[PDB]
Design a protein around this ligand. Structure first.
Ligand code: CA
Ligand code: MG
Ligand code: NA
Lengths: 231, 51
RNA sequence: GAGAGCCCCAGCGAGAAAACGGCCCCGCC
């Protein structure tokens, strides 16, 4: 995360961190239930093998409520395309169930029509992760409020194809955006003090660049597929 | 209906028989008033954690 | 919308040094 703020105690309990063989974080994830994590399909090409950490706020000190889960199955969208990051979504089923506790709790899956009319139409969403603080990985979990950007402006802004499985969020010139290491993590939208999954950190033309935005997997397009992958 | 302040629903709102119908995500129960959503456990989805 | 053709298939099946087409989700006459 470039700019934004630290997640204070209990503020981002749905954040998951994908950790490689060296216990180094390289992507985020969103806790959906006791057994299921949402992430980006392209995060599955970043390490040879990995596990999932929950309940972490400060990676520099392994001090208390963290827990590490092995992955039982990977469910990548069959239509993921490396060249475009179209269909950039995957679900992980863990071998052992997460115990919800302080800093560990699921984000809500909304119903699709209501998500479209009521969440995607809000002014902003919230993105979080342990990614870089400018375009240099953060040791602390950060969050950032990102305005929704309308699709026409998004496409006009981008040098690469923005599919219907994507949406823009962030700022034109202001120095706040997701960055490397945040991919796969949560984009959630707040409605009456309840946070609903609306995106997956996907890609960007750099980080916080003038005239560019954050690109997110548009979760509404995948709610039916997520339910398939979790039944 | 649902476009008037989310039909007064806490969470999901939809219309049927020209009337608002409120609903709630998994791990919540619709309240007796038909509008508010009540957590069934200590860590309901979408809530920041306090203990 | 609907049929159909192909593509995809790290989920449930089946099979053969653990990203290796019957079914759910999904894509391109
Ligand atoms: Ca820690
Ligand atoms: Mg295979
Ligand atoms: Na920008």
């Amino acid at each position: 995360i470039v700019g934004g703020q630290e997640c204070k105690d209990g503020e981002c309990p749905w954040q998951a961190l994908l950790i490689n063989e060296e216990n180094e974080g390289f992507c985020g994830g969103t806790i959906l239930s006791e057994f299921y994590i949402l992430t980006a399909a392209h995060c599955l090409y970043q390490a040879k093998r990995f596990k999932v950490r929950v309940g972490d706020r400060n990676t520099e000190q392994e001090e208390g409520g963290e827990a590490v889960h092995e992955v039982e199955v990977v469910i990548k969208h069959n239509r993921f395309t490396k060249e475009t990051y179209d269909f950039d979504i995957a679900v992980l089923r863990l071998k052992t169930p997460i115990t919800f506790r302080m800093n560990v709790a699921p984000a809500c899956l909304p119903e699709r029509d209501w998500a479209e009319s009521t969440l995607m139409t809000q002014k902003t969403g919230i993105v979080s992760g342990f990614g870089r603080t400018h375009e240099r990985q953060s040791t602390r979990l950060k969050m950032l409020e990102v305005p929704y950007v309308d699709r026409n402006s998004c496409k006009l802004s981008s040098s690469f194809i923005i599919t219907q499985n994507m949406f823009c969020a962030g700022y034109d010139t202001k120095q706040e955006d997701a960055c490397q290491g945040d991919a796969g993590g949560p984009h959630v939208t707040r409605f009456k003090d309840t946070y609903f999954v609306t995106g997956i950190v996907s890609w960007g033309e750099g980080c916080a660049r003038k005239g560019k935005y954050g690109i997110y997997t548009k979760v509404t397009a995948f709610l039916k597929w997520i339910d398939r992958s979790m039944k | 209906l649902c476009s008037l302040d989310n039909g007064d629903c806490d969470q999901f709102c939809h219309e049927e028989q020209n009337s608002v119908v409120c609903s709630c995500a998994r791990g919540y129960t619709l309240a007796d008033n038909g509008k508010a959503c009540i957590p069934t456990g200590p860590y309901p989805c979408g809530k920041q954690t306090l203990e």
